[PDB]
Amino acid sequence: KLPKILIVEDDERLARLTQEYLIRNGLEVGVETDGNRAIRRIISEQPDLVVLDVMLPGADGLTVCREVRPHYHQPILMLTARTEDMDQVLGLEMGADDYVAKPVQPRVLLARIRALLRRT
Amino acid sequence: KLPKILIVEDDERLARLTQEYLIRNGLEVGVETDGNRAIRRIISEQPDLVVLDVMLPGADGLTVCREVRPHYHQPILMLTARTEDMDQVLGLEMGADDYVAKPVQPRVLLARIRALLRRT
16 A cells, blocks of 8 residues: 555656665656656556656646646646746646756655655 | 735845735735744744744744644745755655745745645
8 A cells, every 4th residue: 555656757767767766665656758648647547646757758747737637636746857947837837736856866856755645 | 815924034134025025926924033933923823834944043944843733734835045955855854845945036936835825
């Protein structure tokens, strides 16, 4: 009965390294690399939390938020290299509960994931 | 029926400038400058959200957080110059829902406040 995390990240190698670390810290973690696939997968699998990049093939992160939010109310943590002020404000306003700059220290990501899961 | 914000910040001038900005954006905002006073004030006034610095006289931000949490369940956004990885993890683990580095752009702070209020 571990918390289920879905990592949505185009960088396959980065996604996996992040996945392995979170798994080592009491989380069950899956990885999706396509934005359109993420929308379908998030709605059907209903992860406890989504770690979401803004830049994605198929559908970008902002579009992923808009499309899943009517059917998915769990925390979404945006994790991206798109770190300008406008980008951050826009992500949050579109439905992300957090917006984190890459590269993120593993422990910091874990702490933010835990804090979000705490308020559900 | 505006959201009520309490800013807890030792820099009186910075606190006021931040207060004025948030007020201009549909928030009711108060300012507290002492950690010990903040604990009493947060518990009794029950703000909809607290903007909380780590560095405070009387009682530090982590202590304030620790002390109010059994009697205060609303969002706490830590806003501080204490930006080390360990500091961030500790703040979140202590009960903060967000942890933001100073100086923060006004629009970004507003967005984070709204996202946090959204999750109640």
